[PDB]
Design a protein around this ligand. Sequence first.
Ligand SMILES: OC[C@H]1O[C@](CO)(O[C@H]2O[C@H](CO)[C@@H](O)[C@H](O)[C@H]2O)[C@@H](O)[C@@H]1O
Lengths: 65, 65
Amino acid sequence: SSDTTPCCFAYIARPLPRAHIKEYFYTSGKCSNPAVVFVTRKNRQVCANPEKKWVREYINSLEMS
Amino acid sequence: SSDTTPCCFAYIARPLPRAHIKEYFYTSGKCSNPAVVFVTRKNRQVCANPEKKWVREYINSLEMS
Ligand SMILES: OC[C@H]1O[C@](CO)(O[C@H]2O[C@H](CO)[C@@H](O)[C@H](O)[C@H]2O)[C@@H](O)[C@@H]1O
């Protein structure tokens, strides 16, 4: 794209409360870091590390319904 | 909110209409590519090459307020 695209340069260090998260997306593969961005129920966006167990677990849960 | 950072990975190929732009900013030094972002009246964030004459001219005009 010739528009900006979001990248993550820090990850949240501890799990967000699951119940506060309603969506996720992956940042572009063009970014220097892989990242998951969780979207909260107050529509905040939070960067997280795909390598972490809780992150993969949250993703699996979000795809379950 | 958001802890993502906007980055640019391609530049618009032709000059944006000057009339459509309401401000600019430089992308973060965290991003791998240097870029100017022109923000349009409808809030597009368009990436532009800081080396191009039209980009520098537009910046200079925005700084004149
Ligand atoms: O139009 C969608 C998309 O394009 C950007 C470009 O970075 O993000 C994409 O990057 C990768 C391609 O490397 C794709 O996974 C994916 O479509 C996007 O993350 C971005 O402007 C836009 O989101």
